[PDB]
């Protein structure tokens, strides 16, 4: 005999699309500071175009993950799929954002004047939920054929017989025992919503991504307070106190330390962005091969003879 | 008073015991949404993270947008603006639209219906 | 362009500093120039390694794509374009490779009435390969991914259990072709 | 479990080249239909 179990798998997809005004960071409304910044050349424009490439890359990450399907499918009103109750994982139209209850738990479990700006993501959370609703709609109704082309519509008992024949189990086993499988799947759905309502230690990776980004920004803000050997960290104090050459020496020290701090921050953001890009390509691979079809790669999609997964929208990530 | 960045956030007046909260002035980046210079010279300014008061005006979640006539129709995205809004150059003038997620396709599921590739 | 940056020197030209100044000040100005150009170069080399790492990952992906997709029939869906997969043909490109993933895509669909099993003599019959279909007048057996009907015989089906357990089961006659051979 | 039939098994060679083989009786489904 056997059992059926669902398993979460949480992958970060994109970062927070953060842009830094470099001249405003180093020289906040100062003329002599902007002069000495332009003496140093095209550091500032290069860092701006680098961070812009980062933000475009995370937007491309979100787009290349979530936009695999073109035709946005929608569930039929007769929700009777063999006793498999998908009510928690389907989106809720009665909630003002058309999101799943599971996605509400996922969003619940996740927690200025210096040129530090945050660009919005291109895809909002509701249309990301609409993409995932399309993916579950095609997966439930059409089976795996919607990733291959047209949505060839199939019954759900036929679909589970086909997935069991994909893992080698003959279809008479499921057709003689479908109610036990349905009850086990519904109970596993109950356990996964209980586990998501339990604690955020599963979502500690996504929270760690946001916390790393916040640590980097906060360390950059604290590095604004650093003197780097100057007599003040406030630029306007040095401009008020000193003669212009004697001010400009301290301004050279401040631009030197702040440019090193910005290069450090851009370097950390670049390496973390490459890590997030690799994780996004991994997530896109997992969704393309496990959502859109039946993978026979063992341990690529959780322990066991894999059948399918169902995506859920997460803040800056996806969950299968 | 001080802020989180060791910057002066609030002051007290020296002549009169009055407490003043200092906020720096409303600022944001300037983005230009344009098609190619082969096609036109018409530009649309996207101010970032400010409302369209402190600056053919449409207000986005990304900020103040000037020069894009906002359309309630939905197209595929050509120039991404932010928060689901995209721009295109059609009759011509720069327009803004909520970008389309695609075409909806209802699926005729039944407990005995199939679709076979003939 | 970062050659042209002074970094606080009197000129970005090294020879001008060497030809104008005594070395007790010219060494200081040259030191500022070395600091600026060395910082710019280290930033450039850092960008070089990160971008080369990205292209390295892309090349590993391309090697994986051709080693699975070109050199055999990779049945992983969406690794090799949309659809069921047949070949990919690698063509050279300037600093890259371009594949021609030829794919099997279904074209036209047709609705049929289905049953997961049929019942001939109180016994349940499941198809060994495919799915039972009905055009409305007869129950026929076909392939999962192409429509070609056949008469449902004993050799198309495997018997498992009785007709009580499964749902959606209809009543038909399973043809035994051994019976006309016995009648022969 | 099912009874070993002629359509469950394919013959190959003889029963001395293989290690671990046991002896049994193969049921022929052609036998009771040919008797009928």
PDB file of N, CA and C in Angstrom, chain C residues 120-164:
ATOM      1  N   UNK C 120     -18.139  -5.564 -19.554  1.00  0.00           N
ATOM      2  CA  UNK C 120     -18.660  -6.521 -20.526  1.00  0.00           C
ATOM      3  C   UNK C 120     -19.468  -7.638 -19.875  1.00  0.00           C
ATOM      4  N   UNK C 121     -18.852  -8.410 -18.987  1.00  0.00           N
ATOM      5  CA  UNK C 121     -19.558  -9.513 -18.350  1.00  0.00           C
ATOM      6  C   UNK C 121     -19.516  -9.357 -16.840  1.00  0.00           C
ATOM      7  N   UNK C 122     -19.765  -8.143 -16.359  1.00  0.00           N
ATOM      8  CA  UNK C 122     -19.589  -7.865 -14.947  1.00  0.00           C
ATOM      9  C   UNK C 122     -18.150  -7.607 -14.570  1.00  0.00           C
ATOM     10  N   UNK C 123     -17.266  -7.508 -15.557  1.00  0.00           N
ATOM     11  CA  UNK C 123     -15.844  -7.319 -15.339  1.00  0.00           C
ATOM     12  C   UNK C 123     -15.416  -5.982 -15.920  1.00  0.00           C
ATOM     13  N   UNK C 124     -14.526  -5.302 -15.204  1.00  0.00           N
ATOM     14  CA  UNK C 124     -14.094  -3.959 -15.579  1.00  0.00           C
ATOM     15  C   UNK C 124     -12.913  -4.061 -16.532  1.00  0.00           C
ATOM     16  N   UNK C 125     -12.926  -3.263 -17.592  1.00  0.00           N
ATOM     17  CA  UNK C 125     -11.853  -3.274 -18.573  1.00  0.00           C
ATOM     18  C   UNK C 125     -11.211  -1.897 -18.627  1.00  0.00           C
ATOM     19  N   UNK C 126      -9.927  -1.845 -18.369  1.00  0.00           N
ATOM     20  CA  UNK C 126      -9.137  -0.638 -18.501  1.00  0.00           C
ATOM     21  C   UNK C 126      -8.257  -0.749 -19.734  1.00  0.00           C
ATOM     22  N   UNK C 127      -8.002   0.350 -20.445  1.00  0.00           N
ATOM     23  CA  UNK C 127      -7.109   0.278 -21.608  1.00  0.00           C
ATOM     24  C   UNK C 127      -5.663   0.127 -21.166  1.00  0.00           C
ATOM     25  N   UNK C 128      -4.919  -0.733 -21.864  1.00  0.00           N
ATOM     26  CA  UNK C 128      -3.501  -0.864 -21.554  1.00  0.00           C
ATOM     27  C   UNK C 128      -2.712   0.343 -22.040  1.00  0.00           C
ATOM     28  N   UNK C 129      -3.205   1.025 -23.068  1.00  0.00           N
ATOM     29  CA  UNK C 129      -2.541   2.206 -23.587  1.00  0.00           C
ATOM     30  C   UNK C 129      -3.573   3.093 -24.259  1.00  0.00           C
ATOM     31  N   UNK C 130      -3.774   4.265 -23.672  1.00  0.00           N
ATOM     32  CA  UNK C 130      -4.687   5.213 -24.262  1.00  0.00           C
ATOM     33  C   UNK C 130      -5.887   5.501 -23.380  1.00  0.00           C
ATOM     34  N   UNK C 131      -7.020   5.737 -24.037  1.00  0.00           N
ATOM     35  CA  UNK C 131      -8.253   6.130 -23.369  1.00  0.00           C
ATOM     36  C   UNK C 131      -9.426   5.666 -24.227  1.00  0.00           C
ATOM     37  N   UNK C 132     -10.459   5.139 -23.574  1.00  0.00           N
ATOM     38  CA  UNK C 132     -11.723   4.883 -24.250  1.00  0.00           C
ATOM     39  C   UNK C 132     -12.361   6.193 -24.673  1.00  0.00           C
ATOM     40  N   UNK C 133     -12.922   6.225 -25.880  1.00  0.00           N
ATOM     41  CA  UNK C 133     -13.683   7.381 -26.348  1.00  0.00           C
ATOM     42  C   UNK C 133     -14.999   6.921 -26.945  1.00  0.00           C
ATOM     43  N   UNK C 134     -15.933   7.857 -27.069  1.00  0.00           N
ATOM     44  CA  UNK C 134     -17.169   7.645 -27.800  1.00  0.00           C
ATOM     45  C   UNK C 134     -17.437   8.843 -28.692  1.00  0.00           C
ATOM     46  N   UNK C 135     -17.814   8.571 -29.935  1.00  0.00           N
ATOM     47  CA  UNK C 135     -18.276   9.597 -30.852  1.00  0.00           C
ATOM     48  C   UNK C 135     -19.762   9.866 -30.705  1.00  0.00           C
ATOM     49  N   UNK C 136     -20.430   9.159 -29.798  1.00  0.00           N
ATOM     50  CA  UNK C 136     -21.860   9.244 -29.646  1.00  0.00           C
ATOM     51  C   UNK C 136     -22.612   7.996 -30.044  1.00  0.00           C
ATOM     52  N   UNK C 137     -22.067   7.181 -30.940  1.00  0.00           N
ATOM     53  CA  UNK C 137     -22.739   5.953 -31.346  1.00  0.00           C
ATOM     54  C   UNK C 137     -21.983   4.686 -30.979  1.00  0.00           C
ATOM     55  N   UNK C 138     -20.657   4.734 -30.855  1.00  0.00           N
ATOM     56  CA  UNK C 138     -19.892   3.568 -30.441  1.00  0.00           C
ATOM     57  C   UNK C 138     -18.751   3.996 -29.533  1.00  0.00           C
ATOM     58  N   UNK C 139     -18.395   3.097 -28.622  1.00  0.00           N
ATOM     59  CA  UNK C 139     -17.214   3.221 -27.780  1.00  0.00           C
ATOM     60  C   UNK C 139     -15.987   2.590 -28.408  1.00  0.00           C
ATOM     61  N   UNK C 140     -14.985   3.434 -28.646  1.00  0.00           N
ATOM     62  CA  UNK C 140     -13.763   3.095 -29.353  1.00  0.00           C
ATOM     63  C   UNK C 140     -12.578   3.442 -28.462  1.00  0.00           C
ATOM     64  N   UNK C 141     -11.420   2.879 -28.792  1.00  0.00           N
ATOM     65  CA  UNK C 141     -10.189   3.094 -28.037  1.00  0.00           C
ATOM     66  C   UNK C 141      -9.232   3.880 -28.929  1.00  0.00           C
ATOM     67  N   UNK C 142      -8.450   4.781 -28.332  1.00  0.00           N
ATOM     68  CA  UNK C 142      -7.574   5.633 -29.114  1.00  0.00           C
ATOM     69  C   UNK C 142      -6.324   5.977 -28.323  1.00  0.00           C
ATOM     70  N   UNK C 143      -5.395   6.623 -29.016  1.00  0.00           N
ATOM     71  CA  UNK C 143      -4.153   7.084 -28.416  1.00  0.00           C
ATOM     72  C   UNK C 143      -4.417   8.338 -27.593  1.00  0.00           C
ATOM     73  N   UNK C 144      -3.560   8.595 -26.601  1.00  0.00           N
ATOM     74  CA  UNK C 144      -3.726   9.778 -25.763  1.00  0.00           C
ATOM     75  C   UNK C 144      -3.411  11.062 -26.522  1.00  0.00           C
ATOM     76  N   UNK C 145      -2.492  11.006 -27.481  1.00  0.00           N
ATOM     77  CA  UNK C 145      -1.998  12.220 -28.114  1.00  0.00           C
ATOM     78  C   UNK C 145      -2.288  12.301 -29.603  1.00  0.00           C
ATOM     79  N   UNK C 146      -3.036  11.354 -30.157  1.00  0.00           N
ATOM     80  CA  UNK C 146      -3.500  11.475 -31.531  1.00  0.00           C
ATOM     81  C   UNK C 146      -4.815  10.723 -31.633  1.00  0.00           C
ATOM     82  N   UNK C 147      -5.721  11.194 -32.478  1.00  0.00           N
ATOM     83  CA  UNK C 147      -7.000  10.508 -32.631  1.00  0.00           C
ATOM     84  C   UNK C 147      -6.887   9.490 -33.754  1.00  0.00           C
ATOM     85  N   UNK C 148      -6.834   8.216 -33.391  1.00  0.00           N
ATOM     86  CA  UNK C 148      -7.116   7.126 -34.319  1.00  0.00           C
ATOM     87  C   UNK C 148      -7.907   6.074 -33.550  1.00  0.00           C
ATOM     88  N   UNK C 149      -9.099   5.741 -34.021  1.00  0.00           N
ATOM     89  CA  UNK C 149      -9.922   4.783 -33.282  1.00  0.00           C
ATOM     90  C   UNK C 149      -9.619   3.352 -33.695  1.00  0.00           C
ATOM     91  N   UNK C 150      -9.771   2.433 -32.746  1.00  0.00           N
ATOM     92  CA  UNK C 150      -9.774   1.011 -33.048  1.00  0.00           C
ATOM     93  C   UNK C 150     -10.941   0.357 -32.333  1.00  0.00           C
ATOM     94  N   UNK C 151     -11.318  -0.829 -32.815  1.00  0.00           N
ATOM     95  CA  UNK C 151     -12.272  -1.668 -32.104  1.00  0.00           C
ATOM     96  C   UNK C 151     -11.636  -2.139 -30.809  1.00  0.00           C
ATOM     97  N   UNK C 152     -12.364  -1.991 -29.706  1.00  0.00           N
ATOM     98  CA  UNK C 152     -11.852  -2.412 -28.413  1.00  0.00           C
ATOM     99  C   UNK C 152     -11.909  -3.928 -28.318  1.00  0.00           C
ATOM    100  N   UNK C 153     -10.742  -4.561 -28.291  1.00  0.00           N
ATOM    101  CA  UNK C 153     -10.661  -6.009 -28.244  1.00  0.00           C
ATOM    102  C   UNK C 153     -10.176  -6.459 -26.878  1.00  0.00           C
ATOM    103  N   UNK C 154      -9.983  -7.774 -26.764  1.00  0.00           N
ATOM    104  CA  UNK C 154      -9.399  -8.338 -25.555  1.00  0.00           C
ATOM    105  C   UNK C 154      -7.935  -7.941 -25.417  1.00  0.00           C
ATOM    106  N   UNK C 155      -7.232  -7.817 -26.541  1.00  0.00           N
ATOM    107  CA  UNK C 155      -5.820  -7.469 -26.525  1.00  0.00           C
ATOM    108  C   UNK C 155      -5.571  -5.975 -26.370  1.00  0.00           C
ATOM    109  N   UNK C 156      -6.615  -5.154 -26.361  1.00  0.00           N
ATOM    110  CA  UNK C 156      -6.443  -3.732 -26.109  1.00  0.00           C
ATOM    111  C   UNK C 156      -6.637  -3.392 -24.646  1.00  0.00           C
ATOM    112  N   UNK C 157      -7.122  -4.346 -23.859  1.00  0.00           N
ATOM    113  CA  UNK C 157      -7.617  -4.076 -22.522  1.00  0.00           C
ATOM    114  C   UNK C 157      -7.028  -5.057 -21.523  1.00  0.00           C
ATOM    115  N   UNK C 158      -6.983  -4.633 -20.268  1.00  0.00           N
ATOM    116  CA  UNK C 158      -6.670  -5.533 -19.172  1.00  0.00           C
ATOM    117  C   UNK C 158      -7.763  -5.462 -18.115  1.00  0.00           C
ATOM    118  N   UNK C 159      -8.162  -6.640 -17.649  1.00  0.00           N
ATOM    119  CA  UNK C 159      -9.303  -6.810 -16.761  1.00  0.00           C
ATOM    120  C   UNK C 159      -8.797  -6.726 -15.330  1.00  0.00           C
ATOM    121  N   UNK C 160      -9.464  -5.917 -14.509  1.00  0.00           N
ATOM    122  CA  UNK C 160      -9.048  -5.719 -13.128  1.00  0.00           C
ATOM    123  C   UNK C 160     -10.250  -5.405 -12.254  1.00  0.00           C
ATOM    124  N   UNK C 161     -10.628  -6.357 -11.404  1.00  0.00           N
ATOM    125  CA  UNK C 161     -11.747  -6.153 -10.512  1.00  0.00           C
ATOM    126  C   UNK C 161     -13.084  -6.319 -11.216  1.00  0.00           C
ATOM    127  N   UNK C 162     -14.121  -5.798 -10.565  1.00  0.00           N
ATOM    128  CA  UNK C 162     -15.483  -5.850 -11.071  1.00  0.00           C
ATOM    129  C   UNK C 162     -15.963  -4.433 -11.355  1.00  0.00           C
ATOM    130  N   UNK C 163     -17.232  -4.324 -11.746  1.00  0.00           N
ATOM    131  CA  UNK C 163     -17.739  -3.056 -12.258  1.00  0.00           C
ATOM    132  C   UNK C 163     -18.281  -2.181 -11.139  1.00  0.00           C
ATOM    133  N   UNK C 164     -18.263  -2.686  -9.908  1.00  0.00           N
ATOM    134  CA  UNK C 164     -18.843  -1.948  -8.796  1.00  0.00           C
ATOM    135  C   UNK C 164     -17.919  -0.837  -8.316  1.00  0.00           C
TER     136      UNK C 164
END
